[PDB]
Design a protein around this nucleic acid. Structure first.
Ligand SMILES: O=c1[nH]cc(CO)c(=O)[nH]1
Ligand SMILES: O=c1[nH]cc(CO)c(=O)[nH]1
Lengths: 245, 244
DNA sequence: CCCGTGAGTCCG
DNA sequence: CGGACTACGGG
């Protein structure tokens, strides 16, 4: 009963259905680090999904300087290389916007959401085995979208049409991964993810609770004030602190 | 070298460029450093035999000069007759029909190249004299058309296509200027002028960068007495002396 | 070409 | 409510 190989296959399944869609209009570039950063992604899943999980943290999509460069979700380079200890070759999506070049583990920029994310669990837990013992992390959509200028588009900033097909498809995948991991509880990082997961799972009556935490993005002011403080508090109300040690 | 190193720098450059891909408005792309390599390497072999003090730098080829001869500002009469370079020229994989490459048979004369080489002919007489201490090169070797075959400069390109290219063309420029020993770069036009200062100041190269007006007949100021303005600018920058 | 007047983005 | 940076059209 290791989910790794089935998680990875839910993901290659999902890469398939997505390779099929065509985007438009405000969208000019699309990148899926799940193709070009497969190696480190695999290595994450292999090393850290060796067994079934009670909790799943769930973010919305990769950001430009985290998962888009490392393949690990909330994948800020330094914490991924020094704490998770995941290395891997990464190549380059087929068309790059010059302001959003993939440099892999030689990325200079630090993604603030991801560094916050993992810096909390690194304080909470010490050692990655402790945090992954019962938990795991994953994103609802692995694709990353940019307009003509390099400006990032979330899935919600997408026009109606491609947006509903694309979420419909990730919603089904999300249900498989949840079943494969074996989880009792899911914490969306951010409102979009908590809602979306909720609506996904109840639509196939999967019997799992969906809570949330504050997103650590710096576009959100309450987060720049003491994200870790708030969240350590949100995880205590959810009853998960005993889980991570 | 620097003939041989200069060429290695250009062949590393083509290879980065053979990767990229364009679109949108860009429908054709030619590289005369591939189909016109021979007359380009004769040019270099003949006139880049020692280190240099000055580097004239244009922006990119035009449709009837370097696109046809593989020499920078390479208008066919001045190239064959004063510089004395000839060479087989083959053809781009996909030609726009109204811009077929015909090499040293091109009936069109590029006005820019004609002005530019004529000036130096009159100034220096014999090319060996021009190239005792100078050389000429373009920042970018590709040429671009749109569906109708009209020319797009690197400046006419959408931003995303343009930044990738130009940042692959800068490195090259640095490598080139470190290979020739150049102490002065003169951009032929504002665009190369500004582009090369940005670029050499960044690697912190020991080198000045100045500018002369561009000959293109698209520039209204260049249509009356370009030759006479550029002789003035060149006098200020003080290189009339090295030009004998 | 060469320049001027100006919109899109970022400010973690 | 700003400041700095860095597509297109007329000459
Ligand atoms: O800036 C320019 N203009 C025109 C030519 C002609 O081929 C050139 O080589 N460089
Ligand atoms: O003589 C020329 N030279 C250069 C051009 C530029 O495309 C032209 O149209 N006519």
């Amino acid at each position: 009963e290791s989910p790794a190989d089935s998680f990875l296959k839910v993901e290659l399944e999902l890469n398939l259905k997505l390779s099929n869609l065509v985007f438009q209009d405000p969208v000019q570039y699309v990148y899926n680090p799940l193709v070009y950063a497969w190696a480190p992604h695999e290595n994450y899943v292999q090393t850290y999904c060796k067994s079934k999980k009670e909790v799943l943290f769930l973010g919305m999509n990769p950001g430009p300087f985290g998962m888009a460069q490392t393949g690990v979700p909330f994948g800020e380079v330094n914490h991924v290389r020094d704490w998770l200890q995941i290395e891997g070759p990464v190549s380059k999506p087929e068309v790059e916007h010059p302001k959003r070049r993939i440099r892999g583990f030689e990325c200079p920029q630090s993604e603030v959401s991801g560094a916050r994310f993992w810096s909390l669990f690194k304080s909470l837990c010490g050692q990655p085995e402790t945090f992954f013992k019962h938990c795991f992390v994953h994103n609802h959509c692995p694709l990353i979208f940019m307009n003509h200028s390099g400006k990032n588009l979330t899935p919600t900033d997408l026009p109606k049409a491609q947006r509903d097909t694309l979420l419909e498809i990730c919603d089904e995948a999300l249900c498989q991964a949840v079943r494969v991991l074996g989880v009792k509880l899911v914490i969306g990082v951010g409102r979009f993810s908590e809602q979306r997961a909720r609506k996904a799972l109840m639509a196939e009556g999967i019997d799992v609770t969906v809570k949330g935490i504050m997103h650590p993005s710096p576009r959100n002011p309450q987060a720049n004030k003491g994200w870790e403080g708030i969240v350590r508090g949100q995880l205590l109300e959810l009853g998960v602190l005993s889980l991570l040690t």
